[PDB]
Amino acid sequence: EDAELLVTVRGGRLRGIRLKTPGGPVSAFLGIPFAEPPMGPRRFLPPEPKQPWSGVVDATTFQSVCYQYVDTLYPGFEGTEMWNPNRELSEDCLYLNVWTPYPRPTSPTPVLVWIYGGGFYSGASSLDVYDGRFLVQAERTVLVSMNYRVGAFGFLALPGSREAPGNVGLLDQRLALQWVQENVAAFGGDPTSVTLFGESAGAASVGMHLLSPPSRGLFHRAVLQSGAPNGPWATVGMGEARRRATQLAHLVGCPNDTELVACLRTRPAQVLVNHEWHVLPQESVFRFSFVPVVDGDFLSDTPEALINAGDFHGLQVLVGVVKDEGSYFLVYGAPGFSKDNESLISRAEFLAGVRVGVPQVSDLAAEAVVLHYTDWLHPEDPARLREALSDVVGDHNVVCPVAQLAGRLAAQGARVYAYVFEHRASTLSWPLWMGVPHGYEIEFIFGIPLDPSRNYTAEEKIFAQRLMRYWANFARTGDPNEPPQWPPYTAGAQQYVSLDLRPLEVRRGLRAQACAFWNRFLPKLLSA
Amino acid sequence: EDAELLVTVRGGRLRGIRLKTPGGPVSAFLGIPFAEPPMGPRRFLPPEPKQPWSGVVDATTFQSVCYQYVDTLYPGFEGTEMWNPNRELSEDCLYLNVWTPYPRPTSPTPVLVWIYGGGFYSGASSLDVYDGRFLVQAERTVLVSMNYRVGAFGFLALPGSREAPGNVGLLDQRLALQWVQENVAAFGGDPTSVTLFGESAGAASVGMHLLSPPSRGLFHRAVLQSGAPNGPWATVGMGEARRRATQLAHLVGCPNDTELVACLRTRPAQVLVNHEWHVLPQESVFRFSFVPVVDGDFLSDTPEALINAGDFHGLQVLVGVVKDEGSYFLVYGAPGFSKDNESLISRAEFLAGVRVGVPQVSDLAAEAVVLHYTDWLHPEDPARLREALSDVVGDHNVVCPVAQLAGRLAAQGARVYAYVFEHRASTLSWPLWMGVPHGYEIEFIFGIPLDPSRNYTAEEKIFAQRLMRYWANFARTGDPNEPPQWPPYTAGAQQYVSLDLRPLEVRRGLRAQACAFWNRFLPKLL
């Protein structure tokens, strides 16, 4: 037997598994329980810590995925299936994963913690694109990732109630971060140098840990990829959380908060999932039913407020976006879009698609969106309208939320590095018109191109290794630069770098013109 | 007695004068009475036709300039003085001028009628840059220009009242155009080929005659240079008109509309003028106290509505703007601006300037302006801010009004040609940073560079003869072309031409992205 694959944590003993990468072996401990299964009367409640166990927990395989909707948009299409659960669904899903070099480091190694995205309704640590083995080998960090509850199980909120307080998925994350503090050294990780990194709802989560004091003590650096806590989709007010929870009850046959939540616990998990999307208040895309709630507890105020008021001296942050943030979301409900044609929409479809991409704004607000995003020299050109609506959805939801976060963090004392990821993966199966879509940088960050049994080019394997160097550099020193230079982003110079097969190129302004509209002007309009 | 300088019209007989040009001679009839002097009891009242006369009126010099404010911003400076009155100020001022070829034409000749600008508060047909002798000599047309009352005397309204109905200055113009219909034939002109053209408030006036059916029978074609009736300064609502009249009265000692007007009527013309600028409701630029009023009579609705509703089939229109419409106005009130330095304003001065250039809008509207006109990669670059405030004032008051007009006119039946004047005169005396300012294409249209005693280049003289040809061709045929082409402006293609020393170049969209803001979004916000 191998003693590098045997580890004792506070709760008990663990057997890991040796994993093979093209560059060497890696120790993996998959499926370590870190909470009491949130089942039956624990559904919707905050997570209890895992009671200790006797015997040796088997940690050689990924564990269950938390209950979530499964995407049926293009059944069997790799572009959608690569995100769908690849383990059984269960409510007994609160496990985490640790990947470490082989043999286990004998001296403290920096730790990266991966929080996955999925709009807070989906996701799992077991997806192929989140495979830790290549980063761990190439860059000799410790990598942790965890499963957190999603959909109604993680974020259904009857605010003020004791039976469904909201944000328990976030608390799941916090407990994994606490677990890392007490146990990561048993694997060679240094609990005093922990970097969070996430994408989409995972970047939004990272950001919510920045703005929540009880979590801020649990990590030291943050990477936010294509997401931010101040996005219009990442949080919901108390009022609307209660409406959405209440309508979910009605849709599954349920009727006083106590009595309501009681009835919900008796339903099969799948039953709640089936009605998830029907509690959205209008036809939308990039909007999700059960998301974090601003209730004064986990967030004492809105993330936009806590950002504008924070002191971020001592913080290093790496933030960035893909080149075509919006394009992917359009094939989920914008009129005239499909992955199977050119989606050369008409002006009437563009106008229709604008109310779908920007839901619950006034007609005056939507008008202003159409003003800024029409080329009035070419007001009905189909290719121009397709790209324009893509820019609407991507700017409103990702790029300008991110650009505001960066600018306020920088002008308040944090050191910020900003990127735009401009490489379309040669293996990408979505049509060419989607450009570089939401999510398709993750594979390069995790170094999946180095997997020989996949079809990436030689120049892409090198790109991948550059990216894993930047990230791991940032994790070790709060600076991606290997000591052309990657400058910090400031509110004035607004400098960022392009990431692609070409060397680093420095630019200015994350869509600075468009983001004045969404960040400066549009709030003032909604206030009158 | 040269009989080419002797003409009889329905009022009586006229003696003209024979003027020299580089190219030959021209008959001129300057100072023809077309109205009874609007004096004493006739102040503020609609114009009354000139009662017929015995003897020969001797129409051999320009008559007086109607009472108006005199610009004193840079005293002595050629740039401001060239627009100030060159004849005496008098309420007896309703005279018009006819230029015609020497000898007078035998075959009926197309007529150009000129309506001067000056923001509805100033101006005169007798200014040097409106000298008709060169157009007439070079292009064989009849040219008419008239004086019309300005300031309070032309546009003070107490709407509804019989003693001060407003729009009387426009009725002065209308009366001149009736005069042109009954009488231009005697000068060999053709009353069935009349082309109105004007600039700034003159163009706004031309547009109001398009939209007013009684004027519409008096002409056939139109040219609007750097102005339009839908501009935010060219009209005022009945209520704001009455307020401004009533404050003018209180300011000069006057207290019932009949009693109020009668008291105003006893004040020296100069006393009214001296209080004109004080009745404006905000600190502003490009806003003028007494302007046409929308009262259901002359204008049955706002020009915006009348445009949007009008059937313009059968009309040909030539419209355009200079390259930097707004710059010239900033030295009259925007903080940090001067003709005498380089005017590199700060961000704080820029924001302050926006409230001056866009007055009477909400803070929200003002913020929307600051958004569209800031470069957010260079938010505090003084040179970018100067050019941006220039574009704010120019787009809001001229370019976008003109563009909406052109668009709707083409969409709704009219043939339209559009231009951007892009040549900075060599003799221009305003600073470089203002570019090609408001008003400085006019001298090239009237052929002033052909005057030997001025210092224009040989290029500028060729360019002026080009422009006079375009304008004259348009007046004759409704098409500035003659057998590179100048294409019609259309609502979809938005095609226009650049006028400068280089040959015609076709461009696309009159500041289309900007004007979407002012013409589509901004109203909906208000």
Ligand SMILES: *[C@@H]1O[C@H](CO[C@@H]2O[C@@H](C)[C@@H](O)[C@@H](O)[C@@H]2O)[C@@H](O[C@@H]2O[C@H](CO)[C@@H](O)[C@H](O)[C@H]2NC(C)=O)[C@H](O)[C@H]1NC(C)=O
């Ligand atoms: C691009 O496709 C969309 C989506 O249509 C679906 O996918 C196509 C590949 C084809 O299989 C269609 O039959 C599918 O319905 C087209 O928009 C649809 O147009 C149909 C009419 O044929 C209409 O009934 C649907 O409502 C439309 N769907 C949406 C989401 O608006 C679109 O016309 C195609 N674009 C082209 C051909 O340029």
Ligand SMILES: *[C@@H]1O[C@H](CO[C@@H]2O[C@@H](C)[C@@H](O)[C@@H](O)[C@@H]2O)[C@@H](O[C@@H]2O[C@H](CO)[C@@H](O)[C@H](O)[C@H]2NC(C)=O)[C@H](O)[C@H]1NC(C)=O
């Ligand atoms: C450009 O000039 C303006 C106007 O100032 C006037 O003209 C100058 C040529 C000089 O003669 C000044 O003394 C005149 O008052 C400047 O703005 C003025 O600044 C003064 C302070 O010196 C201030 O009292 C006035 O309020 C300002 N006037 C306005 C209309 O804002 C401006 O500073 C000059 N720009 C430069 C030098 O870059």
Ligand SMILES: COc1cc2c(cc1OC)C(=O)[C@H](CC1(F)CCN(Cc3ccccc3F)CC1)C2
């Ligand atoms: C079931 O009715 C709906 C389903 C969805 C929407 C709207 C619906 O009705 C309004 C979306 O907007 C969702 C689309 C994504 F939001 C878009 C891209 N992802 C891929 C992805 C997953 C994880 C991490 C990164 C990533 F890029 C899939 C879902 C689904």
Ligand SMILES: COc1cc2c(cc1OC)C(=O)[C@H](CC1(F)CCN(Cc3ccccc3F)CC1)C2
């Ligand atoms: C006395 O207080 C003011 C005086 C003026 C303004 C504002 C004031 O206080 C707010 C303007 O904005 C006016 C300036 C023009 F706006 C610019 C110069 N022109 C000359 C001109 C005349 C005819 C045709 C074209 C042309 F360019 C006229 C006035 C003056």
